[PDB]
Write a protein that binds this ligand. Structure first.
Ligand code: FAD
Ligand code: FAD
Ligand code: COA
Ligand code: COA
Ligand code: CL
Ligand code: CL
Ligand code: CL
Ligand code: CL
Ligand code: CL
Ligand code: CL
Ligand code: MG
Ligand code: MG
Lengths: 437, 437
């Protein structure tokens, strides 16, 4: 079948590649509105920090290389502006020439992702971070203006990674956020180490703070404070790239995302949606779920490839919402329903704080593990872990437990790999099980 | 009920403690033949390495403290010499007075563990490592003799830990082993980094090598080599501490271990056996298993506590055999049936070697993950991982998968916690699943 893909990055390029693995005959074309395909989204903060300096890590392919390797046509600077689903074409604007044209399809795969929100100020010193064009612009502005003082707005995982990287680059960032709800995927009372790490390094922060006005480099804040900054990086949320979809017969929810079934099919025949744009359900509970992260983009890409060119019995089983971020010496990871969703259940919480490994063993650090379970069936609803060591390990194990419908009580039976550098004869996970009841 | 426990360490002290949690009324007495209760068996190599300086780390309790906190009576230097099972008493030798007496019980819990094997040479320079007395003796001998050159006999995981610690303490060890099967719980080909690490630090080793004769500090070997050594640490296996049990009605296997049911009951009413002395079965396959490690001692301790004083529907579900060792920069972890047990199945092997985390993120290293599955039912039989980073995480996840008899194919569905320092959007675990078709 002739396959058209919208968006040439985490969902879209991956999906096209997976289809080509299975099907060497079909024509495949990807439209991408911006300059680059296959940029490494998650690498971008580290490019800014000069931690990742090799351009070959910042993006995997140019369209020419992608074609030479996979015989997939990718048209960059081509923006899909409408889906004409009744005639099975999309309308595409060639942004170089400013001319539009129709492209026909047998199958259409939508992976347009999300765009960064803006505070809307008229400021030449303000930047958002979503792609490699943005990353290049920030790097160039830093060099062109000998940037020293940077204001980082927003305290989600992206902003936090950007702040750490600016600091490691030798710059002097200040963090602000409109509320005290930093790193919102993590339990609110488990995020203190973020603030501790800022304090330890004398990196200023102000919560419940906002930009009030901008006059050149002079920034006036909600608090009344007035400061001079060389640069501003705004991390104030994202919005779905779905305006171009609205006129079509594809069903969008009220927030602008596309609900899909377990085959990642939209309501319209022959049209799939994957990545940040798509909404589905949790695997472990009967609730809607949207998890705009790389795992889901890649898993959906594989499932859609099977649907189109492989084993079409392969279907999604839902999200668990596993997520993680590093901030300086600490790891913050969680899985399951969001804190705000716990209220839809009768639940209990159990927690343990213990060394990540043998107490007598050096380099030890306190790991805090928390587990919420449903009182009606003893099933695990949510888990969260924060510490310098071992948090990723405990959360991945719990993700696998939830995949298997394990009860909190069965955690006593988890057989951990124990030697002094790694865990305890009764691991934190076991202790959750013992402490439950 | 009046409770008597034999052995006051990983299984015994833990079980007594767990019973007290549930039952504050019953009299509990533990007999321990040696000087110390509750010593940290797994810390001992690190005490030798002076990595653990604070001897407070090597001993968790004295009998006086145990009685103060838990009202449990522990008698050290008291060796149980016979079980008079029909009258429900044990015969106990007070090793300080050399007088024996009988102690009655309503319930008897055997956790006598295992003793170190010896090569049987008449040598004052040779030591084995099993308890804190042994650790003290080794440390004292090193100081008294200004030991430099040390012969480490045996290449099992504990001997390897002893070798590393001697090296880091500043001594010069040589490793020998009677066969080429070093670190035998791991796949033989995946053990190469042990030899690499030895070579990198110019630590000599000889496999298929044995001591032929000892004449003072002059050691003659099977190879014909003659070398001078200041000290020898023999790690040549262990044997069950069951000689005192043979006259009783308790059934022992041909190797001297005690088969138990899933309640850790022996064949004799009111007598339980836990820890290294006990044999059981695998959880995921129908085969006998013996896994003489700390997790199993602690888990059995809790189950027996519930049987005696708690919820008597709580039973063991079998072992998976999860195990792990660190050797210098590398981690070696495995779970499931042993290499020699694979032949009892029709099986296939899948493997991947990939960076532990995102390739662009600094400090990466290649992680080798291998999974064996049963061709009759796709179920995971065994998994092994070796690398500088991430091996413990992958093997713990697969232990949780096997606990639920998960299939190899379902690994594609595992939802990893992904950010660049930790994994990949398609994790090594996912890749095993994708590669299994
Ligand atoms: C700085 C940063 C750090 C991140 N770190 C992590 C992390 O550590 N872990 C994690 O799991 N996730 C992380 N993410 C999120 C992750 O990158 C996303 O979940 C993933 O990119 C989603 O894939 P996608 O295909 O839906 O969107 P994208 O990868 O953003 O690609 C969508 C593409 O569609 C194009 N497009 C949109 N509309 C049109 C149109 N009408 N016509 C043509 N092209 C169009 C866009 O220009 C864009 O290039 C990070 C994201 C950012 C920006
Ligand atoms: C140096 C070393 C390192 C180790 N490292 C690890 C590791 O990294 N990971 C892991 O999982 N396991 C490790 N182990 C193994 C672990 O310690 C055992 O599996 C665990 O101790 C078993 O518990 P147990 O109660 O059966 O035996 P033990 O803990 O050895 O206790 C048994 C006790 O019973 C006493 N006893 C025996 N007979 C009598 C009698 N007739 N009367 C009175 N008392 C008696 C003994 O003197 C002994 O103190 C290590 C063991 C050693 C020696
Ligand atoms: S934000 C976090 C993640 N970042 C992003 O995703 C950024 C944008 N990513 C993309 O654009 C695509 O993911 C790109 C990078 C374009 C994918 O193309 P690649 O050529 O780089 O990677 P491929 O998936 O095409 O294949 C690479 C190798 O990995 C193994 N492999 C992939 N898929 C499978 C499956 N389904 N089954 C078994 N193995 C698979 C392969 O061994 C493969 O190399 P081979 O040539 O097949 O040996
Ligand atoms: S070689 C590797 C293993 N070898 C060893 O274990 C060495 C010898 N070990 C022992 O002697 C015992 O294991 C000792 C050290 C005496 C400890 O016994 P317990 O395993 O029963 O644990 P503690 O009584 O010392 O309590 C410590 C903390 O763990 C909590 N806890 C234990 N058991 C439970 C149960 N069943 N349910 C809920 N919580 C439990 C304790 O309450 C305690 O928490 P703290 O806040 O640290 O007090
Ligand atoms: Cl990436
Ligand atoms: Cl139309
Ligand atoms: Cl705690
Ligand atoms: Cl220990
Ligand atoms: Cl008798
Ligand atoms: Cl039996
Ligand atoms: Mg129209
Ligand atoms: Mg504590």
């Amino acid at each position: 079948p002739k396959i058209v893909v919208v968006g040439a990055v985490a969902g879209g390029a991956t999906c096209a590649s997976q289809i080509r693995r299975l099907d060497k005959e079909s024509d495949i074309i990807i439209f991408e509105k911006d300059r680059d395909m296959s940029f490494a989204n998650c690498a971008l903060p580290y490019v800014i920090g000069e931690v990742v300096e090799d351009r070959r890590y910042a993006l995997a392919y140019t369209p020419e290389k992608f074609y030479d390797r996979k015989q997939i046509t990718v048209k960059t600077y081509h923006e899909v502006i409408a889906i004409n689903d009744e005639r099975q074409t999309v309308s595409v604007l060639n942004r170089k020439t400013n001319e539009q044209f129709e492209e026909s399809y047998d199958k259409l795969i939508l992976s347009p992702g999300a765009s960064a929100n803006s505070l809307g100020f008229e400021s030449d010193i303000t930047f958002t971070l979503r792609n490699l064009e943005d990353t290049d612009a920030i790097d160039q502005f830093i060099k062109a203006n000998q940037v020293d003082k940077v204001l980082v707005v927003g305290a989600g995982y992206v902003s936090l990674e950007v702040l750490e990287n600016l600091y490691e680059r030798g710059l002097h960032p200040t963090l602000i956020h409109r509320s005290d709800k930093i790193n919102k995927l993590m339990d609110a009372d488990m995020n203190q180490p973020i603030l501790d790490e800022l304090d330890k390094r004398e990196i200023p922060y102000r919560l419940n703070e906002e930009i009030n006005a901008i006059n050149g480099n002079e920034i006036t804040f909600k608090s009344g404070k007035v400061e001079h900054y060389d640069m501003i990086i705004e991390g104030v949320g994202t919005h779905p790239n779905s305006k171009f979809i609205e006129s079509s017969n594809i069903k969008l929810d009220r927030k602008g995302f596309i609900p899909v079934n377990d085959k990642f099919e939209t309501n319209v025949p022959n049209i799939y949606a994957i990545g940040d744009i798509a909404t589905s359900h949790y695997r472990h509970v009967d609730l809607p779920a949207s998890v705009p992260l790389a795992w889901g983009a890649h898993r959906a890409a594989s499932i859609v490839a099977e649907q189109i060119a492989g084993n079409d019995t392969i279907e999604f089983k839902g999200f668990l919402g596993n997520n993680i971020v590093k901030f300086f010496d600490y790891t913050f990871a969680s899985v399951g329903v969001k804190p705000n969703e716990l209220k839809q259940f009768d639940y209990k919480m159990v927690e343990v704080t213990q060394g990540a490994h043998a107490n007598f063993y050096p380099g030890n650090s306190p790991l805090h593990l928390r587990v919420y379970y449903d009182t009606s069936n003893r099933q695990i609803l949510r888990a969260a872990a924060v510490g310098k060591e071992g948090a990723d390990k405990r959360i991945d194990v719990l993700s696998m437990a939830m995949m298997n419908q394990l009860t909190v009580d069965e955690l006593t039976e988890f057989e951990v790999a124990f030697a002094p550098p790694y865990s305890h004869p009764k691991d934190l996970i076991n202790m959750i099980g013992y402490k439950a009841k």
